[PDB]
Design a protein around this ligand. Structure first.
Ligand SMILES: Nc1nc2c(ncn2[C@@H]2O[C@H](COP(=O)(O)OP(=O)(O)NP(=O)(O)O)[C@@H](O)[C@H]2O)c(=O)[nH]1
Ligand SMILES: Nc1nc2c(ncn2[C@@H]2O[C@H](COP(=O)(O)OP(=O)(O)NP(=O)(O)O)[C@@H](O)[C@H]2O)c(=O)[nH]1
Ligand SMILES: [Mg+2]
Ligand SMILES: [Mg+2]
Lengths: 275, 100, 146, 294, 67
């Protein structure tokens, strides 16, 4: 289903714990090292349930995967610890996964990006990708992101990942635009309810959706202290977030800050049924 | 000294002056109970309000009694009321419900 | 369906217009304010005026309270029954502070149309004003809150 | 007014300064380097405070300090846990001797610091028996100044924020009125707890009578952070409401001088709008309250 | 010469009032009780002036002259 792979220490399980199991960036340092493959069955959109093959990272396991379980094993999120002394190793184990994969969607994550200094982050991601894409051609076009636990770009990672397996894009984009129309918004965003990943934009900050994913994850993770789950939040009458469907939450931003609450919430509720 | 007297009375006068502000704000607030039982909103007629602004009339059947004819009254009545009703019609800018 | 805010603010703002009769020397002040509110809560859905937004939202809750109290009782005056296209409703005439108010339920719906005016503005006149305005809210008849 | 923030060299003076005032990510304070010359972070809000770090090197009562202490509202000495604090206490008693000598009315607050990692039991264990050795070195020095104020604080937590709140609150003159005035706001409206926060600082100027369970302070602080984080994203008064499944409401409204009222509302069953409209009405008069104290 | 008008419904409140009408609203009390002929008209005088009544469709127009 979903292959979570990469050498030891690269925080595969750390990611799994954050975006899925709702660990925070801090608590994940607790996690014991993945022994063989830890499977995780969790649903997205209700309609599709996902199986997360959180593979082992240690070389013992790694070299085993391409041996007595190669057929068994064969999307692949392959992650990369930036600091690795043995870079060309990790490149070549990626190559090892690749050939067996022709036996049978590829995503590369430069994880732990929070460690390398801000200036040589751009340059360092560039050179690494220049390589991996060339290696990947044996696929023609490779898409992969810089990824850290300590920033929001982890969410933007999996957003562009999960939506790659969502068929609703044709239906939903049509069904969301048609909500933007009536509401006279600046934009509406659709997120999944539990994971908080971006599903769809309607129509001037570029890092909106990744950040919102983060801020909202943290309000919701914070809400536990009051002992109840998040439903709605209304800001300045400008910004509206509502729980909507059983497997959807919407971030609306209105153009006028005085269209009465009960109206927006009423229109939210009528639209709520559809999707 | 005497300066200390004067200033000490003041500080205490300012102190009570603050107690006033507190008490006024405290007085001014509203409860949800007050909302439920409040008799601010009551049924009203114009008869009532003029009667609280704070036998009388004798009838005449004689034909000679009227200074405006029955036909004059009829025309004024129909005129006033129709002007009111016509002036009372008001149009929606568009459909109040939308599809989707 | 879902409600067109712009058109509702429009209608409500058109209802603010006063009367300038010259059958006689009769003329009214403009309607002070005018809202369509929820029948369930007494929360503003749309308003027009000739923080105050709160003062209104508040008044709404007070009026809705008395309306539902009156509306749900055993038994006869400051309440006009009205028939519109076989849809039936009640117009109520209240005094609140110094104001002349006038609330009628939009038939079959969870929406009350409520007018607020000056003391100078007579009740019997507002009754007409609201009834005649009501007759143009055909789009909303039977709107149950989502 | 102003406050003296002193301690045993390299113990978390500049640390809590940067994290309280600049919302610094604390591991960036790990790489902070020794300020050897007295530095002061001003703080405005309701009172116009001024926090002055002193480098420290025992007490050494200098020539200037006689007026400086006579010019101090309150004194916050920070004792680093996880180091021999007996030297800190030996020194501390000498400082409070000078303060009390010069200005007898000084409020003395002591921060038991770097307590985050240690177990709750290890903390209780430390506190009950540090208080003892603190009053010990003072019993030897004349009478006992009733300045008993031990605030167990961790920079990596909400502990400092709560402490500093209780510290600054202790200085505010109009406080007694704020509490009772704010108190019966939350009595008329359906509010279990309300705090006046400095939005930037995250410390609180006033709360109500009912118990400040730190879980709740935490919710309100985190709420502020959320509303600001979201608001800052989109710019093309300042208020924020959120409702949870159980019906409870978190409310925030901008108020005079960088403050912001943040409150938790019980539904008790009623409509949200009714609760929100009554709230807004009361909070409007409340805003008129603290507008008419300045 | 007309000195004022009141025009009221049968609930008690008023539809319009000009001249003395707006002042002497109290009259609707006694006025609404007046015995009308089969045509719906009446002439009454009670206070140094003469009121004329007409009632069409539950709406009475009262107009005012003098003695
Ligand atoms: N600074 C930083 N540390 C990270 C990040 N991701 C993970 N780590 C740290 O690195 C460790 C990686 O642990 P884990 O998630 O088990 O990695 P893994 O890829 O599952 N290894 P294995 O499969 O061998 O068990 C965690 O303890 C965590 O503290 C990141 O983005 N930034
Ligand atoms: N665990 C923990 N570490 C802390 C805490 N406060 C500070 N530290 C760490 O301990 C060091 C000392 O803190 P710092 O504020 O720099 O000390 P200082 O009192 O300013 N030194 P100086 O007297 O030279 O001005 C810092 O590098 C910081 O990382 C705390 O509450 N908990
Ligand atoms: Mg692991
Ligand atoms: Mg320092």
């Amino acid at each position: 289903k979903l292959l979570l792979m990469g050498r030891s220490g690269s925080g595969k399980s750390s990611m799994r714990s954050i975006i899925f199991s709702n660990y925070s960036a801090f608590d994940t340092r607790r996690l014991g090292a993945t022994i063989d493959v830890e499977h995780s069955h969790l649903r997205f959109l209700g309609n599709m349930t996902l199986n997360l093959w959180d593979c082992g990272g240690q070389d013992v396991f790694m070299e085993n995967y391409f041996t007595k379980q190669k057929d068994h094993i064969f999307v692949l999120i392959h992650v990369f610890d930036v600091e690795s002394t043995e870079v060309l190793k990790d490149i070549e184990i990626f190559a090892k996964a690749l050939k067996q994969l022709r036996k049978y969607k590829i995503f590369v994550l430069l994880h732990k990006m929070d460690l390398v200094q801000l200036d040589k982050r751009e340059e360092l991601f560039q050179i690494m990708m220049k390589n991996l894409s060339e290696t990947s051609s044996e696929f023609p076009n490779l898409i992969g992101f810089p990824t850290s636990i300590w920033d929001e770009s982890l969410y933007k990672a999996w957003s562009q990942i999960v939506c790659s397996l969502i068929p609703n894009m044709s239906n939903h984009q049509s069904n969301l635009k048609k909500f933007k129309e009536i509401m006279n918004a600046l934009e509406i965003i659709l997120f999944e309810r539990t994971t908080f990943l971006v599903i769809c934009s309607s129509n001037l900050d570029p890092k909106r959706f990744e950040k919102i994913s983060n801020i909202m994850k943290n309000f919701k993770q914070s809400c536990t202290k009051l002992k109840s789950g998040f439903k709605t939040l209304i800001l300045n009458n400008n910004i509206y977030v509502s729980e909507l469907s059983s497997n959807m939450v919407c971030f609306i931003v209105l153009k006028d800050m005085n269209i009465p609450q009960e109206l927006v919430l009423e229109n939210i509720k009528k639209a709520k049924e559809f999707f | 000294r005497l300066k200390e007297h004067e200033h000490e009375q003041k500080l205490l006068a300012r102190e009570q002056e603050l107690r006033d502000i507190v008490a006024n704000t405290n007085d001014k607030l509203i409860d949800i109970s007050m909302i439920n039982n409040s008799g601010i909103v009551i049924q009203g007629t114009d008869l009532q309000e003029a009667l609280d602004k704070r036998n009388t009339f004798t009838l005449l059947t004689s034909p000679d009694s009227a200074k405006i004819s029955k036909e004059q009254l009829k025309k004024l009545h129909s005129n006033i009321l129709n002007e009111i009703f016509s002036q009372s019609q008001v149009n929606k800018p568009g459909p109040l419900t939308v599809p989707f | 369906v879902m409600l067109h805010s712009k058109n509702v603010k429009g209608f409500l703002e058109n209802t603010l217009k006063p009367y300038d009769l010259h059958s006689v020397d009769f003329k009214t002040s403009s309607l002070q304010s005018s809202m369509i509110i929820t029948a369930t809560n007494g929360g503003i859905l749309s308003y027009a005026t000739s923080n105050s937004v709160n003062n209104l939202k508040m008044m709404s809750l007070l009026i809705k309270d008395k309306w539902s109290e009156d509306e749900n009782d055993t038994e006869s005056n400051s309440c006009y029954p009205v028939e519109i296209d076989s849809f039936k409703t009640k117009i109520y005439t209240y005094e609140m502070e110094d104001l002349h108010t006038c609330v009628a339920q939009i038939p079959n719906s969870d929406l009350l149309l409520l007018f607020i005016a000056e003391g100078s503005f007579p009740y019997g006149l507002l009754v007409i004003k609201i009834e005649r305005a009501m007759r143009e809210l055909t789009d909303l008849f039977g709107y149950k809150l989502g | 007014a102003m406050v003296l923030l002193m301690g045993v060299r390299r113990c978390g003076k500049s640390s809590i300064c940067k994290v309280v005032f600049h919302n610094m990510q604390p591991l960036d304070t790990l790489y902070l380097e020794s300020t050897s010359n007295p530095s002061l972070e001003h703080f405005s809000t309701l009172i116009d405070l001024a926090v002055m770090e002193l480098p420290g090197q025992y007490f050494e009562p200098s020539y200037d300090s006689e007026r400086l202490f006579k010019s101090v509202g309150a004194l916050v000495y920070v004792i680093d846990s996880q180091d021999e604090y007996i030297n800190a206490i030996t020194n501390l008693a000498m400082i409070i001797e000078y303060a009390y000598k010069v200005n007898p009315s000084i409020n003395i607050e002591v921060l038991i610091h770097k307590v985050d990692g240690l177990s709750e039991d290890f903390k209780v264990d430390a506190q009950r028996d540090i208080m003892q050795r603190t009053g010990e070195e003072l019993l030897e020095l004349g009478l006992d100044g009733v300045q008993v104020s031990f605030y167990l604080t961790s920079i990596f937590d909400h502990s400092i924020y709560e402490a500093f709140s209780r510290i600054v609150q202790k200085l505010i003159p109009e406080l007694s009125f704020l509490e009772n005035m704010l108190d019966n706001l939350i009595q008329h409206s359906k509010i279990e707890k309300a705090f006046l926060f400095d939005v930037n600082s995250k410390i609180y100027v006033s709360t109500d009578s009912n118990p400040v369970d730190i879980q709740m302070y935490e919710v309100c602080s985190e709420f502020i952070d959320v509303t600001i984080d979201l608001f800052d994203l989109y710019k093309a008064e300042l208020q924020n409401v959120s409702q949870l499944a159980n019906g409870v409401i978190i409310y925030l409204r901008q108020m005079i001088r960088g403050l912001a009222l943040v409150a938790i509302i019980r539904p008790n069953g009623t409509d949200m709008e009714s609760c929100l409209t009554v709230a807004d009405y009361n909070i409007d008069i409340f805003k008129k309250g603290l507008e008419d104290i300045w | 010469d007309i000195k004022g008008t009141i025009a009221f419904d049968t609930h008690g409140n008023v539809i319009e009032s000009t001249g003395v009408g707006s002042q002497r609203i109290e009259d609707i009390g006694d006025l609404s009780k007046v015995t009308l002929d089969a045509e719906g008209f009446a002439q009454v005088q009670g206070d140094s002036l003469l009121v004329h009544l007409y009632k069409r469709n539950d709406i009475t127009l009262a107009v005012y002259t003098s003695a």
